[PDB]
Design a protein around this ligand. Structure first.
Ligand SMILES: CCn1c(NC(C)=O)nc2ccccc21
Ligand SMILES: *[C@@H]1O[C@H](CO)[C@@H](O)[C@H](O)[C@H]1NC(C)=O
Length: 353
C-alpha cells in the first residue's frame, strides 16, 4: 500500500482550498523514483466546476481522501504484475485541480476555486527531496489521460527545478499515457455555447484564462500570447521538450472519439475512423520511444493486466525496459518504437476486451 501525506505547505491547495498531497511507498534499496499523475477530465468555468464539485468531489478536494491506496500496474511492487519497475520508490499524486496540471492561481476574493496543478507538482518534488529523492538516479514523471498531458506540460519544469536546487545528477524522464490528442475535424459539429458542445480547442482556450494556466517556455515562445492552447496538443509541444519522453497512445482513443462526436458502420464513418488512425500514426512517425496499438480503449499503465497487450510481439513493460537500456545504437531484439500499421480497431488480437 501507498500512504497519504498532505502537503506541509498548506497554501498549495486543491480546488476548494483543502491541502493537496501525495501517496508514497518507499523502496530503501532503490535509486529509482516513479511519480504518477492521475487524470479525470477538467472544468473551465464556474457553472461546470460547480457541477463537478457535486458529483466528482474527490477530484476537487482532499477532505474525503483515504489514508492509503493500493498500487496497481506500473505502481505495483509485485514483479508478477509489474515486470518493469517493481522495486522502485512509488508516488501517486491525486488530481484535485481540474486544470490538466497547468494552473497557478489561488482561491481568493476574486476566484471561487484554486487551480494549482503546476505548483502541486513542484511542491511534491520539493518535499520528497527530504524523504530520499535527493539520492535518486532517475525520476520518471508518468501519468494517464489528463495526467499524460500533464507530463508533457511539466517534465521540463521538473528538470529545471532540480537543476536550480542543486541536484544535477538526477535524470528526469517522462511517460505520457493516453494524453496525445489531435485538434482534428469532428465527425459532427456544434458551436461552443455550453460544456458539451465546446470543442477541445475552445474549451482549453477558455480554461487557460480561468486557471492562469502555464505551458513550457520554448513552446510558449513559438505560439506567443493568446495561442498557448497549442501547447496542450502532444504533437505540437513534444518537439520543444528536452527531457526524454516515452509516448503511449491507443490509435482509436475513446476520449478522442468522444470529443469528435463519434459513438453497423456506414461508409462515411468508416472513412472517418480509418483517417483518424492514419493521422495519429503520422504524428508518431518521428517519436523514437512510443507504444501505439490499434485498439479502441483509454488509459493503460495502472491497470493490473497492462502486461497483456503487445505490438509486433513486444509488450509495454518490455518496451519500457528497452527504453531504460537505450538511455544507458538500437538494441537487438529490444525495440522502443512500436506503432501498429493495421487500420481498424481490434485488428491487433491482443487488444483489451
Ligand atoms: C480529448 C480531449 N482532451 C484533452 N485535450 C488536450 C489538448 O489535452 N485533454 C483531455 C484530458 C482528459 C480527457 C480528454 C482530454
Ligand atoms: C508555499 O508555496 C508557495 C507557492 O509555490 C510559495 O510561494 C511559498 O514560498 C511556499 N511556502 C513555503 C513556506 O515554502
Amino acid at each position: 500500500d501507498l500512504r497519504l501525506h498532505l502537503l506541509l505547505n498548506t497554501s498549495v491547495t486543491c480546488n476548494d482550498g483543502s491541502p493537496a498531497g501525495y501517496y508514497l511507498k518507499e523502496s530503501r534499496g532503490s535509486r529509482r523514483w516513479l511519480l504518477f499523475l492521475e487524470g479525470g477530465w477538467y472544468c473551465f468555468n464556474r457553472e461546470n466546476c460547480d457541477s463537478r464539485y457535486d458529483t466528482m468531489r474527490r477530484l476537487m478536494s482532499s477532505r474525503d481522501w483515504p489514508r492509503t491506496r493500493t498500487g496497481t500496474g506500473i505502481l505495483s511492487s509485485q514483479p508478477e504484475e509489474n515486470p518493469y519497475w517493481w522495486n522502485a520508490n512509488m508516488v501517486f499524486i491525486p488530481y484535485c485541480s481540474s486544470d490538466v496540471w497547468s494552473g497557478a492561481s489561488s482561491k481568493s476574493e476574486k476566484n471561487e476555486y484554486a487551480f494549482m496543478g503546476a505548483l502541486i507538482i513542484q511542491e511534491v518534488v520539493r518535499e520528497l527531496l527530504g524523504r530520499g529523492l535527493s539520492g535518486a538516479k532517475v525520476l520518471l514523471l508518468a501519468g494517464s489521460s489528463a495526467g499524460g498531458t500533464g507530463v508533457l506540460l511539466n517534465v521540463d519544469r521538473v528538470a529545471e527545478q532540480l537543476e536550480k536546487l542543486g541536484y544535477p545528477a538526477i535524470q528526469v524522464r517522462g511517460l505520457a499515457d493516453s494524453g496525445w490528442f489531435l485538434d482534428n475535424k469532428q465527425y459532427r459539429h456544434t458551436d461552443c455555447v455550453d460544456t458539451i458542445t465546446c470543442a477541445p480547442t475552445e474549451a482549453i482556450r477558455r480554461g487557460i484564462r480561468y486557471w492562469n494556466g502555464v505551458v513550457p517556455e520554448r513552446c510558449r515562445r513559438q505560439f506567443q500570447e493568446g495561442e498557448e492552447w497549442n501547447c496542450f496538443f502532444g504533437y505540437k509541444v513534444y518537439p520543444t521538450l528536452r527531457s526524454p519522453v516515452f509516448v503511449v497512445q491507443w490509435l482509436f482513443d475513446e476520449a478522442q472519439l468522444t470529443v469528435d462526436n463519434v459513438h453497423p458502420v456506414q461508409e462515411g464513418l468508416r472513412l472517418y475512423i480509418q483517417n483518424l488512425g492514419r493521422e495519429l500514426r503520422h504524428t508518431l512517425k518521428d517519436v523514437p520511444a512510443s507504444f501505439a496499438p490499434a485498439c479502441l480503449s483509454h488509459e493503460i499503465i495502472i491497470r493490473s493486466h497492462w502486461t497483456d497487450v503487445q505490438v509486433k510481439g513486444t509488450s509495454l513493460p518490455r518496451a519500457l525496459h528497452c527504453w531504460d537500456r537505450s538511455l544507458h545504437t538500437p538494441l537487438k531484439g529490444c525495440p522502443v518504437h512500436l506503432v501498429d500499421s493495421c487500420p481498424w480497431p481490434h485488428c491487433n488480437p491482443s487488444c483489451p476486451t
